[PDB]
Amino acid sequence: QVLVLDGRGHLLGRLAAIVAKQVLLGRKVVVVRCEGINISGNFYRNKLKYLAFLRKRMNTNPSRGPYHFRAPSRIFWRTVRGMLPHKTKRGQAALERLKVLDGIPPPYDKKKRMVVPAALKVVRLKPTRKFAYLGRLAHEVGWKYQAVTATLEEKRKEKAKMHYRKKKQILRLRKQAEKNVEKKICKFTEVLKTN
């Protein structure tokens, strides 16, 4: 009943629009690994845009004003909130369906991740265009947990490597068993109706 969408390789707005449209329908969406979301344009251009956004702030009381977030997950959350009607009760109720998270936590490392090809940088941008990584962009402005994020990502990748090796061994054994039991299993129906 949930949609676990990977974050790496997807464009910021191209993915956020799809998530904002899918949340208003009722599907609970969880965007994992938000530090890999790419943004079109020059990295210095995106940095200048983010700094111009940071400059905007209430004069009389900055604490009671625009709350600028530094984590890339919170950046993506604010981007989706900018498209959702958050000032109405429908948008307020839909905002809990979206779960933006940095890294791949225990509740989501075992779940298979989905990829939306309509937001992938490979098909969205030309191979000669410049892009900026949201993780580096956030780390350059008031983000401190990039090192531990990368360390935990390395750990979970080294674990998933062994898991995939085990799965590949199981697949090899399955293919060997299929090739071994040739008799007693005709299954001409499977071939005539093509699996």
């Binding site: 208003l24 329908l25 009722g26 429908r90 839909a94």
Partner: protein, 109 residues
């Protein structure tokens, strides 16, 4: 046993930008994402099923907390497989983003 209806979500009523029409509702049925695929669901009955605190009589069995609003598919909507519907009574605004089961009672093929 097993489900005998298609799944559809209520996105909103038929509306422009600064006005709504509560008599006609829009449905996003799962599996249909094109205009050439919604011709099968034209005329199919639809049911918005919810629960209340006072049990009401049911056609089969003892009274239950279940209450259903009936309607049917009128025509298609757009090119993205969205469909239209008109119920006996207009859908409540709280049903936006919830499920209306599309039956297969009126069968043509």
């Amino acid at each position: 046993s097993g489900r005998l209806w298609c799944k559809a979500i209520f996105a909103g009523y038929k509306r422009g930008l600064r006005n709504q029409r509560e008599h006609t509702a829009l449905l996003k049925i799962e599996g249909v994402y094109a205009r050439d695929e919604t011709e099968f669901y034209l005329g199919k009955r639809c049911a918005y099923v919810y629960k209340a605190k006072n049990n009401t009589v049911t056609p089969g069995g003892k009274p239950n907390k279940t209450r259903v609003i009936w309607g049917k598919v009128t025509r298609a909507h757009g090119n993205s497989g969205m469909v239209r519907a008109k119920f006996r009574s207009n859908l409540p605004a709280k049903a936006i983003g919830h499920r209306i089961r599309v039956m297969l009672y009126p069968s043509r093929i």
